[PDB]
Amino acid sequence: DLPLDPLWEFPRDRLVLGKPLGEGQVVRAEAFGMDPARPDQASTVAVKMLKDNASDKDLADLVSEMEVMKLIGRHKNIINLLGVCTQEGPLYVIVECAAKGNLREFLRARRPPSEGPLSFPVLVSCAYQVARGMQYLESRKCIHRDLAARNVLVTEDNVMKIADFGLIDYYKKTSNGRLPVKWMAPEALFDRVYTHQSDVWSFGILLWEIFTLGGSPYPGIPVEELFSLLREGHRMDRPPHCPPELYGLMRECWHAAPSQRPTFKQLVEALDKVLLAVS
Numbered sequence: 180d181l182p183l184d185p186l187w188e189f190p191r192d193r194l195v196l197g198k199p200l201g202e203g204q205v206v207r208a209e210a211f212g213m214d215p216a217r218p219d220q221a222s223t224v225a226v227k228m229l230k231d232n233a234s235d236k237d238l239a240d241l242v243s244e245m246e247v248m249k250l251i252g253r254h255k256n257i258i259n260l261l262g263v264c265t266q267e268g269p270l271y272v273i274v275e276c277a278a279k280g281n282l283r284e285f286l287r288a289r290r291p292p293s294e295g296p297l298s299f300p301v302l303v304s305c306a307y308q309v310a311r312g313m314q315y316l317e318s319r320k321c322i323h324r325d326l327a328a329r330n331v332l333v334t335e336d337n338v339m340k341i342a343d344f345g346l347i348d349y350y351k352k353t354s355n356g357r358l359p360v361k362w363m364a365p366e367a368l369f370d371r372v373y374t375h376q377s378d379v380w381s382f383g384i385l386l387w388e389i390f391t392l393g394g395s396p397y398p399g400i401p402v403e404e405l406f407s408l409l410r411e412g413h414r415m416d417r418p419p420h421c422p423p424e425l426y427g428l429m430r431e432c433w434h435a436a437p438s439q440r441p442t443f444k445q446l447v448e449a450l451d452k453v454l455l456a457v458s
């Protein structure tokens with residue numbers, strides 16, 4: 180069915196499929212000897228596969244996702260491709276499994292009922308890692324198109340990993356009540372133009388999500404009211420307990436002209452300066 184890539188082929192009999200993670204469909208699995216330095220050791224991985232009644236187009240999209248991940252290469256702040264099963268059975272695409280779920284849920288669960296465990300330098304470090312991940316993806320000509328705290332995964336060691344960059348319906352409200360239009364740069368929403376600078380805008384919204392501990396952007400504003408506010412050049416206010424250093428960066432990400440927004444490289448440098456100063 181598919182060509183053999185000996186660089187990425189992982190033996191399917193060395194995978195123990197487990198619990199479903201989402202719906203292609205994703206399952207948790209145990210892989211033996213995924214690390215060449217540890218030949219028989221188990222690791223927990225995430226495996227993407229086709230549904231039972233998948234079409235030839237669904238196969239194409241999954242193969243395409245796999246190929247893009249191969250080309251992008253490896254980085255500590257992205258969900259990495261670990262292996263593939265293409266021979267003598269169904270197509271499996273094996274990636275890193277982050278134990279602590281998406282960043283939005285990670286932040287919300289740590290809201291204090293009092294001081295929370297996520298102090299200011301931890302929140303800056305979180306933002307810094309996301310910017311480092313985006314800087315890597317940009318250097319690999321990857322435009323995310325939906326960067327948000329829900330699309331960042333958190334490992335057992337609290338390492339931030341950009342998810343779902345290997346590719347949506349912006350107007351459909353998700354089961355968790357997310358409206359993706361709220362992360363769209365104006366040139367993407369109004370003019371269908373997606374660039375690395377439109378991801379910079381989305382990064383600004385993600386910065387706002389971090390400093391509100393997973394708040395929902397433009398709080399209590401319906402989508403129809405959002406369009407008019409964006410046309411007037413309205414921007415979210417400085418949220419509670421957010422210092423001007425961080426709100427200033429959010430405002431820079433939200434400059435109307437994409438050429439006036441900082442680059443992912445400048446955001447990495449700016450967040451590193453904040454972290455060195457406070458810590």
Ligand SMILES: */C=C\C(=O)N[C@H]1COC[C@H]1Nc1ncc2cc(-c3c(Cl)c(OC)cc(OC)c3Cl)c(=O)n(C)c2n1
Nearest residue numbers: 200205225227258272275276277278280342343344345
């Ligand atoms: C690690 C065990 C575990 O149960 N973790 C869960 C806690 O939150 C949800 C889940 N963690 C998790 N970690 C990584 C995921 C990766 C993907 C994913 C896949 Cl399968 C592919 O396949 C090509 C591509 C991706 O991005 C390019 C991603 Cl992000 C995933 O779909 N899920 C659900 C993951 N879940």
